[PDB]
Structures are given as structure tokens and as C-alpha cells.
Amino acid sequence: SGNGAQGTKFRISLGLPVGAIMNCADNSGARNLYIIAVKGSGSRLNRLPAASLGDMVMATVKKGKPELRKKVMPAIVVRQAKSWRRRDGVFLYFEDNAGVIANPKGEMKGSAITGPVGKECADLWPRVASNSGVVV
Amino acid sequence: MKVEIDSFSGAKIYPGRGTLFVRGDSKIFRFQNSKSASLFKQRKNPRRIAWTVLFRKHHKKGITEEVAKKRSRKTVKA
Amino acid sequence: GFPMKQGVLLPTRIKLLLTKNVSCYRPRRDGERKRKSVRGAIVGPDLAVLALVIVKKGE
Amino acid sequence: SHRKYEAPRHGHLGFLPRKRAASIRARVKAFPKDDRSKPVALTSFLGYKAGMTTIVRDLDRPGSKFHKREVVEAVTVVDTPPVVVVGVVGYVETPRGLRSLTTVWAEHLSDEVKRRFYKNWYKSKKKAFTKYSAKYAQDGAGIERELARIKKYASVVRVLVHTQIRKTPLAQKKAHLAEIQLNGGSISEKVDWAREHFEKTVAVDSVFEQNEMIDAIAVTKGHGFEGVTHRWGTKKLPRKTHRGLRKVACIGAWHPAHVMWSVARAGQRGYHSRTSINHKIYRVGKGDDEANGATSFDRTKKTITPMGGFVHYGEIKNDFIMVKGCIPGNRKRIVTLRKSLYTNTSRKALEEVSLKWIDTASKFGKGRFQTPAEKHAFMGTLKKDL
RNA sequence: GUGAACAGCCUCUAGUUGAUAGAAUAAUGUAGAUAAGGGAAGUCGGCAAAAUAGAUCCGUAACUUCGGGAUAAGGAUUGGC
RNA sequence: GCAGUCAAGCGUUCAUAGCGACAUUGCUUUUUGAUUCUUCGAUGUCGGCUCUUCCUAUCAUACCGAAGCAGAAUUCGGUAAGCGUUGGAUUGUUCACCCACUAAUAGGGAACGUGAGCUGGGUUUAGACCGUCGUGAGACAGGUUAGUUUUACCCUACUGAUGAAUGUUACCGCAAUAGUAAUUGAACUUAGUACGAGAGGAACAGUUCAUUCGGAUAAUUGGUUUUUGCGGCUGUCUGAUCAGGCAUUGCCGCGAAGCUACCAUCCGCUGGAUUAUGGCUGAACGCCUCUAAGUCAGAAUCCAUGCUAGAACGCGGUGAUUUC
Ligand SMILES: [Mg+2]
Ligand SMILES: [Mg+2]
Ligand SMILES: [Mg+2]
Ligand SMILES: [Mg+2]
Ligand SMILES: [Mg+2]
Ligand SMILES: [Mg+2]
Ligand SMILES: [Mg+2]
Ligand SMILES: [Mg+2]
Ligand SMILES: [Mg+2]
Ligand SMILES: [Mg+2]
Ligand SMILES: [Mg+2]
Ligand SMILES: [Mg+2]
Ligand SMILES: [Mg+2]
Ligand SMILES: [Mg+2]
Ligand SMILES: [Mg+2]
Ligand SMILES: [Mg+2]
Ligand SMILES: [Mg+2]
Ligand SMILES: [Mg+2]
Ligand SMILES: [Mg+2]
Ligand SMILES: [Mg+2]
Ligand SMILES: [Mg+2]
Ligand SMILES: [Mg+2]
Ligand SMILES: [Mg+2]
Ligand SMILES: [Mg+2]
Ligand SMILES: [Mg+2]
Ligand SMILES: [Mg+2]
Ligand SMILES: [Mg+2]
Ligand SMILES: [Mg+2]
Ligand SMILES: [Mg+2]
Ligand SMILES: [Mg+2]
Ligand SMILES: [Mg+2]
Ligand SMILES: [Mg+2]
Ligand SMILES: [Mg+2]
Ligand SMILES: [Mg+2]
Ligand SMILES: [Mg+2]
Ligand SMILES: [Mg+2]
Ligand SMILES: [Mg+2]
Ligand SMILES: [Mg+2]
Ligand SMILES: [Mg+2]
Ligand SMILES: [Mg+2]
Ligand SMILES: [Mg+2]
Ligand SMILES: [Mg+2]
Ligand SMILES: [Mg+2]
Ligand SMILES: [Mg+2]
Ligand SMILES: [Mg+2]
Ligand SMILES: [Mg+2]
Ligand SMILES: [Mg+2]
Ligand SMILES: [Mg+2]
Ligand SMILES: [Mg+2]
Ligand SMILES: [Mg+2]
Ligand SMILES: [Mg+2]
Ligand SMILES: [Mg+2]
Ligand SMILES: [Mg+2]
Ligand SMILES: [Mg+2]
Ligand SMILES: [Mg+2]
Ligand SMILES: [Mg+2]
Ligand SMILES: [Mg+2]
Ligand SMILES: [Mg+2]
Ligand SMILES: [Mg+2]
Ligand SMILES: [Mg+2]
Ligand SMILES: [Mg+2]
Ligand SMILES: [Mg+2]
Ligand SMILES: [Mg+2]
Ligand SMILES: [Mg+2]
Ligand SMILES: [Mg+2]
Ligand SMILES: [Mg+2]
Ligand SMILES: [Mg+2]
Ligand SMILES: [Mg+2]
Ligand SMILES: [Mg+2]
Ligand SMILES: [Mg+2]
Ligand SMILES: [Mg+2]
Ligand SMILES: [Mg+2]
Ligand SMILES: [Mg+2]
Ligand SMILES: [Mg+2]
Ligand SMILES: [Mg+2]
Ligand SMILES: [Mg+2]
Ligand SMILES: [Mg+2]
Ligand SMILES: [Mg+2]
Ligand SMILES: [Mg+2]
Ligand SMILES: [Mg+2]
Ligand SMILES: [Mg+2]
Ligand SMILES: [Mg+2]
Ligand SMILES: [Mg+2]
Ligand SMILES: [Mg+2]
Ligand SMILES: [Mg+2]
Ligand SMILES: [Mg+2]
Ligand SMILES: [Mg+2]
Ligand SMILES: [Mg+2]
Ligand SMILES: [Mg+2]
Ligand SMILES: [Mg+2]
Ligand SMILES: [Mg+2]
Ligand SMILES: [Mg+2]
Ligand SMILES: [Mg+2]
Ligand SMILES: [Mg+2]
Ligand SMILES: [Mg+2]
Ligand SMILES: [Mg+2]
Ligand SMILES: [Mg+2]
Ligand SMILES: [Mg+2]
Ligand SMILES: [Mg+2]
Ligand SMILES: [Mg+2]
Ligand SMILES: [Mg+2]
Ligand SMILES: [Mg+2]
Ligand SMILES: [Mg+2]
Ligand SMILES: [Mg+2]
Ligand SMILES: [Mg+2]
Ligand SMILES: [Mg+2]
Ligand SMILES: [Mg+2]
Ligand SMILES: [Mg+2]
Ligand SMILES: [Mg+2]
Ligand SMILES: [Mg+2]
Ligand SMILES: [Mg+2]
Ligand SMILES: [Mg+2]
Ligand SMILES: [Mg+2]
Ligand SMILES: [Mg+2]
Ligand SMILES: [Mg+2]
Ligand SMILES: [Mg+2]
Ligand SMILES: [Mg+2]
Ligand SMILES: [Mg+2]
Ligand SMILES: [Mg+2]
Ligand SMILES: [Mg+2]
């Protein structure tokens, strides 16, 4: 979360600790995203920081265009897999872990998002809304 | 408040209850429980599992009174 | 505004291939078919408008 | 040396000692401030915890992303048949604290409470109160002198009430007796009230109402002898470690040469007293009301009892309080609901709820049905049956 | 008998049924298992654990003393009648 | 290592906003030396894991005084240790050094805390390679590889657990003393406002969420499975059938109950007194001064409220109190 995130976010189950790799779901040239940090996460001895739906992470691209590899950039988690629970009572989950590469302000690097996108992320990051097909 | 239904088993899913699965395509599948849920992950075919609605429908089980006549018609002349 | 379509069952919306001679589709060209959103024939509160026909007059 | 990495202690020193409570009936350590301008009433109530279930309602929180949407919420239900009034006890202020100076009892005591004064009912000659009861014979005079004294002295008046345990699916016969501070105005008015209510009966609606914030005072579930890991949430030691690993590796520095009061150790877990606060009353049930578990939006005549009935508890055939969320103690425990010690303005407290739906499906499995009516409808006719 | 089999597992003949016992099932152990999401971020170090495995068929790199490397790698298949 | 005094200088001007030479006075005992008191019929090295507690020379958080403080940001100083102070790559490391999050990633002590608590990577026996030295055996404060980590049942401490005797027994209560707890961030809005030539750019009140911590709880979801509950599968044995036995719980799918997870849900109080500091009235000292007398406002402090024990040698109210 943080910059450019207009909205607050209700807690959702943390799915992705540091080291996790999600699918890159944009058209940027990136094939996956390797999580090295979660923004706005706190501190407890021994705890991995771990992201969830609509969290902004800091990632590198393990697989993808060489102009994207070997460096750290912001991304946003768009699909989960660890099931979480909404305030309408529902426990839901996607089939994959996936997020999209983005700028500190929260602008997509790419122009499409392939696959669905959870609403809690859509609601959080307007330029993500824009590029989303099926939401939730 | 909507009572959704089990996309594997045919059961009513009253609120906050069972699980919701958003697949690759964006096809959403809703389960009443881990049973329908696992049979699902197991690529089991509901029309072959005796207790499901879908299976009962296809096998014409205990329908009886639906395929028993009704009475609904009129007569005008104006 | 999506129209209900008799025979679907379902209280949801689905997208169907439609053909010449059918509800909720008027073909532009000979042998044209279109895949179009359509509402189920089962009433829910998602409807803006129910369409009824009187069969018996009340008191 | 000095830690290395800083971390917060495991566990809260303000809940020591972690020993078993002295009674299953947790004590009310405090009552609301008194406002002697209002009518006389109780300030707490006895009940029994029966179970939980789920609720649906629309939320009202201008500003929330869930404003005007449905939420689903866990709630608990506590069985609550009318408490019966049988004594007043009158306390006086001293430079050594509150001390009781008398207790006046009803003339007739139910077997239920009488049973409470005994360790072996079946054998006993049940003589309890049989000479006190006589004090009424004579015109009434010594019971007046007491009642009178209480008025003359006395800074605070409590009422001896007890529960109607027989009106409850429990086996346990022996009822629960306890003191409840009276807060309606004037020491005299208080005792009058008390006296008038002897042998007579008091119901929860006279004490609690919808959307009120209330506290639950109860003894916590027991667990027996707990290792350090689960009891304090200490880190598991590594796999490699000899001579066991659910432990604390270092029990203290070399000086002070004494294991210290502030380190985690194996020992009793659970069966503690707790005064949990700020639980919202989402329903005040009436036992003489079919359609207890029904709603303005629901309608279907049905009571709060789940299909197959409250697991490990039974039925609910009396008034109850439905509290949002969850409460200390377990199914079957005597539990005390208490008025709040402050006027909370919260907004969160203040919001007035209206249930849309109360879950009613069996909790003994993955229940699919509210009523047996619904179940026959969906399922069809079976090989038993018609 | 199963099976490639003097393997494992089950059985006939023969031989045992010896090894203090009873009641409970707290902590901590020893020995045996399982865990959602993540996947070595743990650690000196993947220690421990997990994963792999039979057979039939297809397919198989560098390099080499030409003998190998090779079950390289990577795939499909397997019941009953 | 840390902190002062003098004040020549620095700082456009201007000693002391922030600094400070020449000198000079100190403090500290996580540096290193100096010493050799104790221990060689033995007090088990380094590091790390875990876990407690303490110090303050305060990094963050609360409230303040200064500024070469317009705003924003920052720097200096006070009261302050209540509460936090992390996730990784390399290295046996402590240290170092990068990446990264963050409100902040402060510094220390407790036999350089902590091996009948672990680990055993380094160091430091016996095997072994190399380099340098030696005629040689061998050496090296050089590099390298492999190398057994013992005991608690005692006492005390600590955690929990019973319990004789103060007529008996029972119920309801008091409260001494002791413990105590909550923490931090962001968004909306205030507001593109105050300030500013502009670039930029706040805060109080209000709202929604979140972090770290804590106490429970099991509606829901998830994990667990000897419900050996239902079904399935292999091998064999009971002549077949039915129904079963054996394979250290044979194997598999589902699986109620219980237990249980920031993997799940719920809940975490409000009064007073004060510190710094800004002030009132006001003399000393006809003027003047927050101070001498008296006094107002005031902080993550403190004392209560509240919350947990309940003194087994603190206590109250009440019930019934045996006869062959
Ligand atoms: Mg793609
Ligand atoms: Mg660690
Ligand atoms: Mg590569
Ligand atoms: Mg999951
Ligand atoms: Mg676009
Ligand atoms: Mg769209
Ligand atoms: Mg499952
Ligand atoms: Mg389950
Ligand atoms: Mg420290
Ligand atoms: Mg660390
Ligand atoms: Mg109290
Ligand atoms: Mg919200
Ligand atoms: Mg009291
Ligand atoms: Mg008296
Ligand atoms: Mg008895
Ligand atoms: Mg127990
Ligand atoms: Mg256990
Ligand atoms: Mg070992
Ligand atoms: Mg530990
Ligand atoms: Mg201790
Ligand atoms: Mg029963
Ligand atoms: Mg249940
Ligand atoms: Mg249950
Ligand atoms: Mg054989
Ligand atoms: Mg033996
Ligand atoms: Mg044996
Ligand atoms: Mg035995
Ligand atoms: Mg065990
Ligand atoms: Mg796992
Ligand atoms: Mg898994
Ligand atoms: Mg993987
Ligand atoms: Mg590592
Ligand atoms: Mg890797
Ligand atoms: Mg590490
Ligand atoms: Mg390491
Ligand atoms: Mg190594
Ligand atoms: Mg290393
Ligand atoms: Mg090694
Ligand atoms: Mg490995
Ligand atoms: Mg090892
Ligand atoms: Mg191994
Ligand atoms: Mg597995
Ligand atoms: Mg090879
Ligand atoms: Mg293979
Ligand atoms: Mg075949
Ligand atoms: Mg120092
Ligand atoms: Mg100058
Ligand atoms: Mg100047
Ligand atoms: Mg000076
Ligand atoms: Mg000096
Ligand atoms: Mg000195
Ligand atoms: Mg010294
Ligand atoms: Mg030093
Ligand atoms: Mg000497
Ligand atoms: Mg010495
Ligand atoms: Mg000696
Ligand atoms: Mg020794
Ligand atoms: Mg020693
Ligand atoms: Mg030795
Ligand atoms: Mg100036
Ligand atoms: Mg400025
Ligand atoms: Mg700025
Ligand atoms: Mg100062
Ligand atoms: Mg100050
Ligand atoms: Mg402290
Ligand atoms: Mg202190
Ligand atoms: Mg903190
Ligand atoms: Mg670091
Ligand atoms: Mg490391
Ligand atoms: Mg370097
Ligand atoms: Mg910073
Ligand atoms: Mg030292
Ligand atoms: Mg040491
Ligand atoms: Mg030791
Ligand atoms: Mg030792
Ligand atoms: Mg060693
Ligand atoms: Mg070694
Ligand atoms: Mg050696
Ligand atoms: Mg060496
Ligand atoms: Mg070595
Ligand atoms: Mg070896
Ligand atoms: Mg050892
Ligand atoms: Mg011993
Ligand atoms: Mg001992
Ligand atoms: Mg003791
Ligand atoms: Mg005697
Ligand atoms: Mg704006
Ligand atoms: Mg602008
Ligand atoms: Mg200017
Ligand atoms: Mg609870
Ligand atoms: Mg817990
Ligand atoms: Mg299983
Ligand atoms: Mg079976
Ligand atoms: Mg099978
Ligand atoms: Mg067979
Ligand atoms: Mg047959
Ligand atoms: Mg046998
Ligand atoms: Mg055997
Ligand atoms: Mg076995
Ligand atoms: Mg259990
Ligand atoms: Mg939560
Ligand atoms: Mg928690
Ligand atoms: Mg709260
Ligand atoms: Mg409290
Ligand atoms: Mg005070
Ligand atoms: Mg004043
Ligand atoms: Mg003045
Ligand atoms: Mg003068
Ligand atoms: Mg003053
Ligand atoms: Mg003064
Ligand atoms: Mg003076
Ligand atoms: Mg506070
Ligand atoms: Mg209070
Ligand atoms: Mg309390
Ligand atoms: Mg005493
Ligand atoms: Mg006592
Ligand atoms: Mg004693
Ligand atoms: Mg006393
Ligand atoms: Mg007493
Ligand atoms: Mg007495």
C-alpha cells in the first residue's frame, strides 16, 4: 500500500512471504515477480514480511525480458491463492499467485492485465482498475 | 442476502459458508464444503456421484409430482 | 437492461450464441449469429422490470 | 551481555498468577457508578453459555467501505431464564473498606437454592433456613429491624438472586446464587425494592436492551498442565535440540541467581477468571416466542435452536441474550453479564443493529438446512416417511 | 501364493505365545505420521525430512582413453473382464 | 569512549543560532594496556539460537524551550527508559559490508547474562595435504580437510498443585499486600489552505483502516484423524458365497467430535496528581521580575479507576449445627 493508494484496506490473510514468486500478469515482458519486500509491513523478530491482495511489494523479475531482469522494482499483488475472508462472510481464493509491475505512485508499467483481478486490489489502485477485465 | 448454490453438488450455500474458487478463466465455482470441494479438485464428474442434484436429475430420481399434471388456463372472448 | 430468455433456467446472466428466429436477437445478415449476454428466466431482485400477463381477473 | 535483537515479552504480566480460579463462578470485581436519580434495577444477570452461530445484518458506518452492505458475524447465545430474588445484603463504608452488616432472606427458599447450601442433598435433613423462616411468624418484627437497619446505615445494597437452573437443559440441579448491586436511587428505595421482590422473579429485559454494550465475567476454559510453548507462546526451539524443544532455552542470567517471576514456565492453563468487556447485545430473546430465530426480513417461524440442538448444550426454551462475537468460558458455564462501567460513545457502540438473518442449521456437521420444513422441501420423500 | 527372486507381505508342517502387572492418558520426551499459503527466507551447511523408484515403449547433451558418459536428461503407458 | 571551563577564531556582518584553536578541569569502565589478589586435588573458549531483567550517554513515539525556525524539512536543548528498535546476501565470526522494509532500525550491563538449555561452524589433542623454516625429529600467533558435547531423583529458586491446627460445617462477601498493558503508522478530510515572489506546503477537530502486543473464543474457513465412521484398492488366509483375519494403525478418497491458526473470529477502560515548560499575582530591590510567600495551565510519567491473585497465622455477613 502507501503512495497513490487512495482508499484504506481491510486486513486480508497474508499469502506471500518474501521469497515467494508470483506470475507476472501484465504485458510488460516480465514472466514472474520474486517478492523481496512488502511495503508498510511491520517488525517482529523472525517474521517474514508477507504480502496479500492489493499490497505493493518490491520485486525483481526472475524470468523475462533482460531489460527488466537484474533489478528491483515495485509491483502490486492482484491474485492470491491463500484463501482469505471478506466482510460478507466469504472465504475465496484464486488459482494462482500474481501481481503486476508498477511505479511508486502506482502506475502500471504495462497496459493489459491478463486473467482476473480481486476487487480489493481494483478498489485500491485505479490504474489497475483501468486495465482489468473480469474483477473478482 | 442470497443463498448461492454448490456448483459441484447442487446444495444451497447459506451465507458465509463453504468456499469460493475463482478459476483461471474467471469461472467462479462455489462449494458448500470440502467434500464437493475435493471431489471437484479430484476432477470427479458430478453426474457420476450418486448424491448430487445433477446426478439425480440426469437419472430421473424421485421427481414424481413435477411430471404430474397441473391446471393453468383461461377463456376470454372480448 | 438485459432481457430474460425463456428456457434458460438460471437466476443469473449468461452469454449465448443466438440465431435467426429467436428472442433477444435480431440478425443483421443471412446466417449471422452473435454471442450475446442474456438474463436467466428465473426472477431475482436484480431485475429492473417484471413482465406479467393477466390470466384471471381479481375481485 | 544484552539481548542482541530486541523483542517484546511473551505474555502479559497483569494476568498472573496463571493458577486455577477459586470458583467456576468468576467474581464481579466492580459495579457501574451509581446514579441515584434513575429507577431501581439490577446491574448484572446470571445465565448459561449455550453456543454460537452466525448473523447477517446490514452495516451502518458512514465512511466504511462496508457502509450499507451486509456483513456476516459470529455471535454467542446465553440461556437466561428469570433470576429469582431471595435476599438483600447491606454494606457500610469503613476505614478498612466495604463491610457487610446484615443479610435478609425471603421466607420461602426454593429447593434449587437450598440445594446450593449443601454437599450431599440426598442424605441431608434439608434443615437449611428452617429457623430463619420462622422469624416471619411473629408479626414480622426482627426482619423489620434488619431491613430497617440496612436503611439506617448502608452505603450500598445488593440483592441475593439465584438462577432457575431447572429451566435449563443442564443436569446440574444445584442453582447459582449471587449478589447484584442495585443502582436505582436512594438507599431506602433500594431496600423497599428488594423487600418487595422476595420470592418474586426478575427477567433480563428489565436489565438489558437491544444494542447495549455489556461485559461478560466468567471462568475460562480449562486445559490442565501446559508446557511453556503453548501457555506463553514461546518460540519452539530448533529440531536439532537435545533433551526437548518446547521449552525456554535460557531460564535466566547467572545473577540474580534465582529463576525470576517474569519467565515463562510449564503450568496450569485455562480455568482463569476474566472480565471481558464491550460485547454488543444483538438480540434479547423471549422464551415464549416461537420465531425467536426469525427476523423482520426472515419471517419463517423458528426458534434460535439449531437443527439437532445446541451441540453439547441442549435446547433454549427461555429468554436469552445474543451477544455479538464471543465471550470467556464454555458451553454450560455460569456466566455473568454486567452493565458497562462507562458510557461509551464509540459510534461502533451506539450503532443500532437489526438482524436480517440468524443461522439455524445444525452445528453437528456441515449443516445444509434451517428448518426440518426446508429439508423435506429440498430433499423429497424418503423411505421412512409417508 | 504373490513376484525377477533364497526380497518384502500372507500361509502349511514343526515350535512359540516366554519379556512384572493394574488404572489413567498432564507437561516434557522417545519412536511413528499429517498439515492451508509461501518454498530454504531456517542453518556454518538443506542437517533432518520430503520428492524419485518396478516394468513396457519412445527419447537421450557436453566430453571421452571410443570401452563410456547412460536408468543421462525428458516423456507415455500399467487394473478387471 | 564520553562531558565541561576560558574564548582567539569560524559562521556575509556577528565570539557563544550551530561550532570552536591554544590551554585547562573532569567523568566512564561494552576499548586496550598495567598489575598478579582469588581460582591450576579445574569456576567447560568464540559466535549464534532462545529467554528474562536492568542501565541511559534517547534512534523512534508524548509534551516542551532554541534556531542563521516564512512554509515544508532539519539542527540544538529539557522532562522522559512508559513503549518499540526488524527482514535478507557474504563471513564460524563478534565486527564489517551491501540489499530492503520501517515510526525508528539507539548504545550498553546482568561471571565479556545465558553449553546437566541447544548447537559445534571457528579456536585447541590424536589422521592428513600444501607453503615457509629446519641436516633431521619436528615447528609455524600461515592456508586446508576429518574429528564421541556425560549426570538431576537432592536443596533452594521459579512455575503450577494439595493441605493439619485456631468449635464443626456451608454459603455469600471484604480487600491489605503484590502484579498490571497496550503500541505505532497510513488514507480521507481539514486543503492545494495557513506561509511563500515562486518552487513548494503543514497542523488541531472529525472519519476509515492498519502495525506490533495482549486476553479469549471455535458460528464460519482451514489443519489434524484409531470415530479404524462410510466407501475404495493390493497380497494372502477362512472350500465358494456372505462376512471377515493378517500386512507394528497395510494403502487411498471423504470424514463427524475434540483440539486448534493473524491460516479463523471477537474484546483490550477513564479519572486525578505532576515533570519539563509557558504563565498569574508579587515582594525582595519605591523600578523590575513565573518565585521568595501564594497560585493557573500542563507529558507515552505517576496514583487511582479498571483487570488478575487473595494474607494458606488479615477480616465481615449469613445458614444449619449430631444425644442411644
Ligand atoms: Mg503472459
Ligand atoms: Mg532469526
Ligand atoms: Mg539464467
Ligand atoms: Mg489457501
Ligand atoms: Mg487503458
Ligand atoms: Mg470490466
Ligand atoms: Mg481438506
Ligand atoms: Mg474440515
Ligand atoms: Mg538492549
Ligand atoms: Mg536477526
Ligand atoms: Mg475492583
Ligand atoms: Mg473500509
Ligand atoms: Mg467490593
Ligand atoms: Mg448484626
Ligand atoms: Mg456428594
Ligand atoms: Mg483437562
Ligand atoms: Mg499438547
Ligand atoms: Mg545432539
Ligand atoms: Mg523459547
Ligand atoms: Mg517464573
Ligand atoms: Mg446431556
Ligand atoms: Mg460443528
Ligand atoms: Mg460442533
Ligand atoms: Mg517369496
Ligand atoms: Mg525387561
Ligand atoms: Mg515386548
Ligand atoms: Mg504397565
Ligand atoms: Mg507428545
Ligand atoms: Mg505446508
Ligand atoms: Mg500444499
Ligand atoms: Mg515449487
Ligand atoms: Mg540463507
Ligand atoms: Mg533459490
Ligand atoms: Mg539467517
Ligand atoms: Mg547462518
Ligand atoms: Mg561451511
Ligand atoms: Mg554463512
Ligand atoms: Mg562442513
Ligand atoms: Mg537443496
Ligand atoms: Mg547437522
Ligand atoms: Mg539427508
Ligand atoms: Mg506429500
Ligand atoms: Mg551427467
Ligand atoms: Mg523420470
Ligand atoms: Mg486396458
Ligand atoms: Mg563510553
Ligand atoms: Mg568574520
Ligand atoms: Mg550573532
Ligand atoms: Mg561559552
Ligand atoms: Mg579547566
Ligand atoms: Mg576517575
Ligand atoms: Mg576503573
Ligand atoms: Mg568503548
Ligand atoms: Mg599469584
Ligand atoms: Mg588473572
Ligand atoms: Mg579447585
Ligand atoms: Mg566442575
Ligand atoms: Mg558453574
Ligand atoms: Mg573438563
Ligand atoms: Mg542572524
Ligand atoms: Mg525556512
Ligand atoms: Mg519539504
Ligand atoms: Mg533544559
Ligand atoms: Mg522544556
Ligand atoms: Mg522499560
Ligand atoms: Mg524503572
Ligand atoms: Mg511498541
Ligand atoms: Mg541488518
Ligand atoms: Mg547470514
Ligand atoms: Mg566490500
Ligand atoms: Mg529515515
Ligand atoms: Mg565487562
Ligand atoms: Mg560469557
Ligand atoms: Mg548454565
Ligand atoms: Mg555441560
Ligand atoms: Mg567446537
Ligand atoms: Mg569442531
Ligand atoms: Mg589436528
Ligand atoms: Mg592454521
Ligand atoms: Mg575443522
Ligand atoms: Mg568424518
Ligand atoms: Mg555439553
Ligand atoms: Mg539426582
Ligand atoms: Mg530440583
Ligand atoms: Mg513451591
Ligand atoms: Mg478440640
Ligand atoms: Mg485534495
Ligand atoms: Mg502542485
Ligand atoms: Mg522567500
Ligand atoms: Mg474470547
Ligand atoms: Mg491463542
Ligand atoms: Mg487421512
Ligand atoms: Mg476399510
Ligand atoms: Mg485407489
Ligand atoms: Mg481380490
Ligand atoms: Mg451372489
Ligand atoms: Mg495369522
Ligand atoms: Mg512381520
Ligand atoms: Mg503400519
Ligand atoms: Mg487436542
Ligand atoms: Mg483478523
Ligand atoms: Mg492474536
Ligand atoms: Mg479494538
Ligand atoms: Mg481494563
Ligand atoms: Mg491522586
Ligand atoms: Mg495563578
Ligand atoms: Mg505577570
Ligand atoms: Mg535598585
Ligand atoms: Mg513554575
Ligand atoms: Mg513558589
Ligand atoms: Mg528571591
Ligand atoms: Mg498510557
Ligand atoms: Mg473506569
Ligand atoms: Mg479487577
Ligand atoms: Mg497475614
Ligand atoms: Mg485466606
Ligand atoms: Mg500452607
Ligand atoms: Mg483486616
Ligand atoms: Mg471468614
Ligand atoms: Mg464468621
Question: Nearest by CB to D65, which of A10, A44, A89?
Answer: A10
Task: Quote the CA–CA distance of D360 and D373 in Å, as a whole number.
Answer: 12
In a domain, A109, yes or no: yes
User: Do at least 3 CB pairs under 8 Å connect A with B?
Assistant: yes
Do D56 and B1 count as a contact with CB atoms less than 8 A apart? Answer: yes
Our CA-based measurement puts residue B27 at a distance from the nearest CA of chain A, in whole angstroms, of 10
Q: Report which of residues 42-61 in chain A place their beta carbon less than 7 angstroms from any atom of strand E.
A: 48, 50
User: Integer distance in angstroms from CA D171 to C1' F286?
Assistant: 93
Helix (H, G, I), strand (E, B) or coil at D205: helix
Contacts of B72 in chain C (CB under 8 A): 55
Return the C-alpha torsion angle A60, A63, A68, A72, nearest 10: 10
Helix boundaries (H) for D182-238: 187-196, 228-232
Contacts of D3 in chain A (CB under 8 A): none
Give me ligand 56 centre to Cα D255, in Å: 22
The HSE-up count of residue D266 (CA atoms within 13 Å, CB side) is 6
Our CA-based measurement puts residue B73 at a distance from the nearest CA of chain D, in whole angstroms, of 27
The HSE-up count of residue A34 (CA atoms within 13 Å, CB side) is 11
Helix D187-196, helix D141-152: angle, nearest 10: 150
Nearest CA in chain B to C12: B4
Q: Please, which residues have CB within 8 angstroms of residue D324's CB and are 6 or more apart in sequence?
A: D55, D73, D75, D279, D280, D281, D282
Find out whether D274 and D217 touch, Cβ atoms under 8 Å.
yes
**Measured over all CA atoms, what is the biggest interatomic distance in chain B, rounded to whole angstroms?**
62
Find out whether A30 and A66 touch, Cβ atoms under 8 Å.
no
C-alpha cell at D186: 436512594
Helix (H, G, I), strand (E, B) or coil at D115: helix
Q: Find the domain containing A49 and state its range.
A: 15-136
CB atoms within 10 A of CB A26: 25
In a domain, A95, yes or no: yes
Q: Is C38 buried (19+), middle (13-18) or exposed (0-12) by CB count in 10 A? A: buried
**Measured at the alpha carbon of residue A85, what is the angle toward residues A83 and A86, in degrees to the nearest 5?**
135
Task: Quote the CA–CA distance of A59 and A72 in Å, as a whole number.
Answer: 5
CB atoms within 10 A of CB D54: 19
Task: Quote the CA–CA distance of A117 and A136 in Å, as a whole number.
Answer: 6
Contacts of C55 in chain B (CB under 8 A): 72-74
Q: Is D196 buried (19+), middle (13-18) or exposed (0-12) by CB count in 10 A? A: exposed
In a domain, A87, yes or no: yes
Q: Which C residues in the span 1-59 are in contact with B, Cβ-Cβ below 8 Å?
A: 55-56
Find out whether D229 and D247 touch, Cβ atoms under 8 Å.
yes
Q: Which A residues in the span 51-110 are in contact with B, Cβ-Cβ below 8 Å?
A: 79, 83, 88-96
The full set of domains in chain D, from first to last, is 16-81+203-220+270-384 (2.40.30.10), 82-202 (3.30.1430.10)
Closest CA to A117 of A134, A101, A100: A134
Task: Quote the CA–CA distance of A81 and D304 in Å, as a whole number.
Answer: 36
The neighbours of chain A, by the rule of 3 or more Cβ pairs under 8 Å, are: B, D
The CATH number covering residue A68 comes to 2.40.150.20
Q: Does A8 touch chain D (CB under 8 A)?
A: yes
Task: Identify the residue whose cell numbers are 441515584.
Answer: D36
DSSP one-letter code for D76:
E
Task: Quote the CA–CA distance of D186 and D37 in Å, as a whole number.
Answer: 8
- How many angstroms separate the Cα of D81 from the Cα of each of D44, D162, D328? 14, 11, 20
In a domain, A8, yes or no: no
Q: Please, which residues have CB within 8 angstroms of residue C54's CB and are 6 or more apart in sequence?
A: none
Find out whether A7 and A39 touch, Cβ atoms under 8 Å.
no
Return the C-alpha torsion angle D14, D15, D21, D26, nearest 10: 80
Do D368 and B32 count as a contact with CB atoms less than 8 A apart? Answer: yes
C-alpha cell at D377: 422441501
Q: How many domains does chain A have?
A: 1
Contacts of C56 in chain B (CB under 8 A): 74
In a domain, A7, yes or no: no
Task: Quote the CA–CA distance of B3 and C45 in Å, as a whole number.
Answer: 13
Closest CA to A88 of D70, C16, B1, B10: D70
Closest CA to B36 of B58, B51, B23, B26: B51
Task: Quote the CA–CA distance of D334 and D341 in Å, as a whole number.
Answer: 21
In a domain, A28, yes or no: yes
**Measured at the alpha carbon of residue A52, what is the angle toward residues A28 and B20, in degrees to the nearest 5?**
100
In a domain, A31, yes or no: yes
Q: How far is CA B4 from the centre of its chain?
A: 10
Closest CA to D273 of D328, D193, D205: D328
Find out whether D159 and D194 touch, Cβ atoms under 8 Å.
yes
Structural biology method used: X-ray
In a domain, A2, yes or no: no
> In the complex, which nucleotide's C1' lies nearest to the CA atom of residue D242?
F118
CB atoms within 10 A of CB D66: 16
